[PDB]
Design an enzyme around this catalytic site. Sequence first.
Site, short mmCIF file in Angstrom:
data_model
loop_
_atom_site.label_atom_id
_atom_site.label_comp_id
_atom_site.label_asym_id
_atom_site.label_seq_id
_atom_site.Cartn_x
_atom_site.Cartn_y
_atom_site.Cartn_z
N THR A 117 9.54 2.75 3.30
CA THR A 117 10.30 3.93 4.12
C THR A 117 11.21 3.43 4.71
OG1 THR A 117 7.90 4.61 4.00
CG2 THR A 117 9.01 4.49 6.33
N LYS A 203 2.06 3.26 16.61
CA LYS A 203 1.41 4.14 15.46
C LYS A 203 -0.28 4.80 16.33
CE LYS A 203 -0.69 2.60 11.22
NZ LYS A 203 0.06 3.03 10.39
N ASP A 237 0.96 8.05 4.06
CA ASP A 237 1.27 6.89 3.29
C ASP A 237 0.21 6.34 3.64
OD1 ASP A 237 3.11 5.44 2.22
OD2 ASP A 237 3.08 4.55 3.77
N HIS A 241 -2.87 4.70 0.57
CA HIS A 241 -2.11 3.27 0.39
C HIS A 241 -3.87 3.31 -0.19
CE1 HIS A 241 1.76 1.78 0.87
NE2 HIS A 241 2.20 2.03 1.31
N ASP A 284 10.44 9.92 2.96
CA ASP A 284 10.74 9.29 2.08
C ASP A 284 10.63 9.03 0.57
OD1 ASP A 284 8.78 8.29 2.84
OD2 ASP A 284 9.26 6.48 4.17
N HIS A 285 9.19 9.17 0.29
CA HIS A 285 8.83 8.44 -0.81
C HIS A 285 7.83 9.57 -1.04
CE1 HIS A 285 6.58 5.97 0.40
NE2 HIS A 285 7.66 5.67 1.34
N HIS A 391 4.09 2.43 -3.58
CA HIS A 391 5.29 2.49 -3.74
C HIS A 391 6.41 1.90 -4.03
CE1 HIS A 391 5.91 2.55 0.33
NE2 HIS A 391 4.96 3.31 0.63
C1 LIG Z 1 -0.51 1.82 7.64
O1 LIG Z 1 0.94 1.45 8.10
C2 LIG Z 1 2.20 2.23 8.01
C3 LIG Z 1 3.35 1.87 9.00
C4 LIG Z 1 4.05 2.67 9.43
C5 LIG Z 1 5.55 2.08 10.55
O2 LIG Z 1 6.18 2.79 10.57
C6 LIG Z 1 7.30 2.50 11.50
C7 LIG Z 1 8.55 3.23 11.62
C8 LIG Z 1 9.25 3.05 13.20
O3 LIG Z 1 10.30 3.55 13.35
C9 LIG Z 1 9.67 1.68 13.67
C10 LIG Z 1 7.91 0.70 13.14
O4 LIG Z 1 8.32 -0.42 13.70
C11 LIG Z 1 7.21 1.47 11.95
C12 LIG Z 1 6.63 0.87 12.12
O5 LIG Z 1 6.54 -0.77 12.28
C13 LIG Z 1 5.39 0.81 10.55
O6 LIG Z 1 4.70 -0.49 11.08
C14 LIG Z 1 4.56 3.54 7.96
C15 LIG Z 1 3.83 3.96 8.00
C16 LIG Z 1 2.44 3.61 7.73
O7 LIG Z 1 1.54 4.08 6.34
ZN LIG Z 2 4.03 2.77 2.45
#
Ligand SMILES: COc1cc(-c2oc3cc(O)cc(O)c3c(=O)c2O)ccc1O
Ligand SMILES: [Zn+2]
Length: 768
Positions: A117, A203, A237, A241, A284-285, A391
Amino acid sequence: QDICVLPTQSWSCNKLRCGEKRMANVLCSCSEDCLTKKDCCTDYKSICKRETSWLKDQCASSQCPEGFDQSPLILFSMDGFRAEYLETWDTLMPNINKLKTCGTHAKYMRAVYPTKTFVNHYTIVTGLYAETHGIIDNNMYDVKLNQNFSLSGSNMRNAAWWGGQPIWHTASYQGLKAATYFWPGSEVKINGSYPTIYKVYNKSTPFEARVMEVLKWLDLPKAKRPDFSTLYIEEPDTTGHKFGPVSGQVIKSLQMADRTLGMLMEGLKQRNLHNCVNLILLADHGMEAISCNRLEYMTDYFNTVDFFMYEGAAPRIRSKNVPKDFYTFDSEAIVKKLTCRKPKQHFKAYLAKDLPKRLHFANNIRIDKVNLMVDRQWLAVRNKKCSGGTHGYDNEFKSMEAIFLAHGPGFKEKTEVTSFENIEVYNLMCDLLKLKPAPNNGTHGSLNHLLKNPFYNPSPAKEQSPPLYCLFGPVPSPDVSGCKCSSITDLEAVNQRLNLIDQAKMQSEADNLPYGRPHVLQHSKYCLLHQTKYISAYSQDILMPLWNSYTISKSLDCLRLDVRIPTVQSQTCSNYQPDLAITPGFLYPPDFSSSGPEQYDALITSNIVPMYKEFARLWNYFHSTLLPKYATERNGLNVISGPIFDYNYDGHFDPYDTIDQYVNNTKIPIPTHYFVVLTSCENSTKTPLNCPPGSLKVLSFILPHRPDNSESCADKSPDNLWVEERMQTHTARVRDVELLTGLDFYSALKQPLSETLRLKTFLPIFIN
Ligand SMILES: COc1cc(-c2oc3cc(O)cc(O)c3c(=O)c2O)ccc1O
Ligand SMILES: [Zn+2]
Ligand SMILES: *[C@@H]1O[C@H](CO)[C@@H](O[C@@H]2O[C@H](CO)[C@@H](O[C@@H]3O[C@H](CO)[C@@H](O)[C@H](O)[C@@H]3O)[C@H](O)[C@H]2NC(C)=O)[C@H](O)[C@H]1NC(C)=O
Ligand SMILES: *[C@@H]1O[C@H](CO)[C@@H](O)[C@H](O)[C@H]1NC(C)=O
Ligand SMILES: *[C@@H]1O[C@H](CO)[C@@H](O)[C@H](O)[C@H]1NC(C)=O
Ligand SMILES: *[C@@H]1O[C@H](CO)[C@@H](O)[C@H](O)[C@H]1NC(C)=O
Ligand SMILES: *[C@@H]1O[C@H](CO)[C@@H](O)[C@H](O)[C@H]1NC(C)=O
Ligand SMILES: [Ca+2]
């Protein structure tokens, strides 16, 4: 009661809610004194003031309220939304499916390697390969900084990690304002600046609240209102997962995504912005299913595992003791003991410079040199001690492809477009913002077919070296070449077939260079060598052709010196010995001409390139049997091939004063790769020569010039049935060959330059 106390928990409006008056604890107002104060649920006018929802509307044809003189652009990212979800489950997603219906929709959008990502999210907003912006994985180690990189660590906000120029900085440096509701990089002080407005990542912020905030940025006064805003959500995502790509759990995460996009669209129609805002909905993917019966253990390949290993779908291996044994770590040894140890290994070992050049995944201190190309649905771990999905795999895999949907006045309506790579999106976004893009790895103008009024018109690359001339001459006083040809009796007569009159040269150009000769965008002293069956650009700078182009129809020890090439600028037979690993291979195969005098046109010093004998095995077999079969399959081919020198693996041609690797006791440079570009036509009732340029079909290879066939583990096979399989993972864009050679192809095609640029960015893929 219940349906007038859900106002505190629900982001939608039910019928019994309208005209309700102010409570303190409402997330979203459904009052009638609502609009004036800019705080209503998206469906307010849809369900109460009986207006038609955006989803129910028909897609109107080719606007914006008063203060909006330029269309705002919203970048919407749904992490892990693989392209097959839209192909299989669009039925269940009415709002996303409306976007597909009436906006511009691509079959899929190719990610970058590794398909993670932060890698791809930053790539999308810079247009740069991961090897260049620096975020080469979610977890990395930089030896120069001696710092670890991690999403849950704090060094992730150190600006030294983040290269390039994201779109929001591009927007601000040229007078626009940008607001990002979550985007990798937006919290970092890249180049000493932030976005005009950004959000600390939390999140737990509900997707609905994010949609409400983006819609509240658009309600700001014109002087404060952002012109570009991103919107990010973690599904599908997160659930993908845990429960895998084919799961009921993902089906309702996908419906939650559809809910939030629809929320955005309803709020946009409320503000009369729905046919004003330019919306890009991408990922992104993708997502791939994994299992524990699908793990590869390094313990099954080592007895002691004294190395650190980034595990998963895209693994790398470095030393455990860093930074002191980082440069010392025997990377080649680990690759070699991971090389064909078992007959059915579900991965392959590579050094970064041996990775397929299409991936562009070397040339960064953070890209550790041991790399593993893992088979789909498998993972490479160190020990024996997993479920759902993951991924990171090769971006050619169907499970890794991302969605791309666009909607708004700046895009075409109800148009399907071919696949493209997300590195192309940065340019397309600045076009819609009327911005000059920072330098990137997109091919600006290749996405013009998506736009309703292209803002940038590509112009041809200026040739940097016109051809010199190598005129016809006599055969030297002695023949110090060391070449011998028993067969030739009238040497003067057969050497005359290399001395064509000016129109005979034209006729051959019409046959063998039907798209015009490649323009040279470097410096190179070279001449053009015309023969009836092939044409080459011979360079005295590297003692060999820059390219050799010929045309074939559906079905189809003698070597001497080229009297046009001066002796000092020549290769000689004596340069090669039978107790050397390198043998002269041909660019134009002499077996393709009819034998007799026409075959002598190809058996000259100007048509040979240095080749490792075991590579010539692959090279000759491809021309032996594979190439004629592709010719019958595609009804003739225009072939153009030549050497590539990329010893520092930057993806660009090496200048000549950079080349150190000659063959023993000579001045002949060893190519790192060889390229082959095969052009036919989609409608195969036509030939490579009578085709409309818009229906041209290209297939290009960049083959690693390597001394063994360890990559195929075919150094002791009694056949060559392995060659096609390995060539099929070394395809490339014509653009990739252009970058690696300093050449520019297809200039003389009679079609708009933007339409040729799609052809050069096309990537041949064979994983079915
Ligand atoms: C299951 O946790 C996930 C965490 C994230 C995640 O995304 C971010 C995006 C940002 O712009 C900045 C970040 O710090 C994160 C992040 O920490 C993150 O865990 C993304 C997808 C996921 O599936
Ligand atoms: Zn992922
Ligand atoms: C993708 O696009 C970027 C940006 O256009 C390209 O990056 C550029 O690459 C060149 C050479 O790789 C860099 O110039 C070099 O600078 C170094 C200093 O570190 C110097 O030692 C060299 O003599 C040369 O001048 C240039 O700075 C760099 N630009 C940016 C913005 O990073 C990249 O090459 C492209 N990749 C591909 C595969 O096309
Ligand atoms: C980075 O983390 C790795 C853990 O894999 C560790 O081996 C290394 O010493 C760490 N380096 C620094 C500078 O923290
Ligand atoms: C960094 O900011 C300066 C202005 O402060 C600008 O001129 C320059 O282009 C920026 N560099 C990058 C790489 O964005
Ligand atoms: C994260 O967001 C939720 C809802 O928006 C909020 O209740 C919570 O306090 C936030 N947490 C942090 C640490 O900001
Ligand atoms: C290819 O072109 C011919 C016209 O010469 C046409 O008859 C044929 O249908 C075309 N094939 C297609 C469109 O698949
Ligand atoms: Ca180079």
